[PDB]
């Protein structure tokens, strides 16, 4: 059967990528929380 | 302070009169191996080698090569080739060794554990 | 600074080789140990690469080694004096090496 995750690299970066996070105040708020935690992976732009 | 040196000296002097061989960490289940140990316990070594060679259990081939070693240890510690009809299996035991855990999937997303067991085998020979 | 160095002649003051003198061969600064010639031999088991057991000096912790007096043959503590600084033997007062 068709499952929930059907990958598309173009969709992934448009929805969760680094440049989309930086485009809004609430996205930059997410980046600040992940930096303060010390995450090695900041966005999906890192795993690529 | 020499106490453990004196305890160990007596331990080594007794080992000169004991003829044995060991198998450690054999990657097969101890219960199946025990089935083979009960077959050759207290039996003349020449007859046991043939019994192990033509056994239908797979654990017997490993045990056959350990009995050969036990006999050779006997001749090293006694300084003569063993006769025929002379030695016999005076002691044998199988102990469970450490277990390797694995995973086998089951229906509806559940997972079960598989145990891949091991064992140790020790054989004594005697005239 | 260390109270001994390569080329020094030192006497062992503790351990099984106490009362024995000898020359310093190598100094392991980080571990604070040194090789003294002819003392603390070991039987190392080497595979061919013809093989066999071979002899080598094992290092002794440097706090068990004292510089031998220039004049007398006994081990002494040392100091440094400006007469740059230079080592000298506390038992006799003469400069060392």
């Amino acid at each position: 059967m068709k499952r929930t995750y059907q990958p598309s690299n173009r969709k992934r970066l448009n929805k969760h990528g680094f440049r989309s996070r930086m485009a809004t105040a609430n996205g930059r708020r997410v980046l600040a929380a992940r930096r303060a935690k010390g995450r090695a992976k900041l966005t999906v732009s890192d795993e690529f | 302070g020499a106490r453990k040196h004196n305890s160990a000296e007596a331990r080594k002097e007794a080992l000169k009169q004991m003829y044995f061989a060991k198998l450690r960490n054999v990657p097969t289940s101890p219960r199946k191996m025990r089935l083979v140990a009960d077959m050759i316990r207290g039996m003349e070594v020449n007859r046991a080698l043939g019994v192990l060679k033509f056994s239908n259990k797979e654990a017997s081939a490993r045990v056959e090569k350990l009995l050969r070693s036990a006999v050779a240890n006997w001749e090293e510690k006694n300084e003569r080739k063993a006769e025929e009809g002379e030695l016999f299996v005076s002691r044998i035991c199988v102990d469970g060794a450490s277990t390797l855990k694995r995973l086998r999937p089951a229906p509806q997303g559940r997972g079960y554990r598989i145990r891949k067991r091991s064992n140790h085998v020790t054989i004594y020979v005697d005239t | 600074k260390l109270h001994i160095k390569k080329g020094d002649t030192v006497m062992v003051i503790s351990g099984e080789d106490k009362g024995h003198s000898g020359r310093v061969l190598e100094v392991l600064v980080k571990e604070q140990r040194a090789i003294v010639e002819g003392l603390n031999m070991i039987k190392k088991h080497a595979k061919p690469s013809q093989g066999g057991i071979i002899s080598k000096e094992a290092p002794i912790h440097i706090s068990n080694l004292n510089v031998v007096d220039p004049k007398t043959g006994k081990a002494t503590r040392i100091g440094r004096r400006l007469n740059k600084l230079v080592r000298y033997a506390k038992k006799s007062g003469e400069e060392i090496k």
Partner: protein
């Protein structure tokens, strides 16, 4: 369908009374002198019932 209780050590060991490895039916080879299974060709010499059966190189 389900065990109401775990079995004690005694009950488990009593059931395992009849779990025995079967001994081979062995015979000595009149030619080689080696052990072989009765009614089979000796794998060492190749002989069977006094005659050569598997001439082994």
């Amino acid at each position: 369908a389900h065990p109401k209780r775990r079995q004690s050590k005694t009950r488990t060991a009593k059931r395992r009374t009849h779990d025995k490895a079967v001994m081979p039916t062995l015979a000595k080879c009149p030619n080689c002198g080696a052990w072989h299974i009765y009614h089979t060709v000796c794998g060492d010499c190749g002989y069977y019932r006094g005659k050569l059966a598997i001439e082994k190189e």
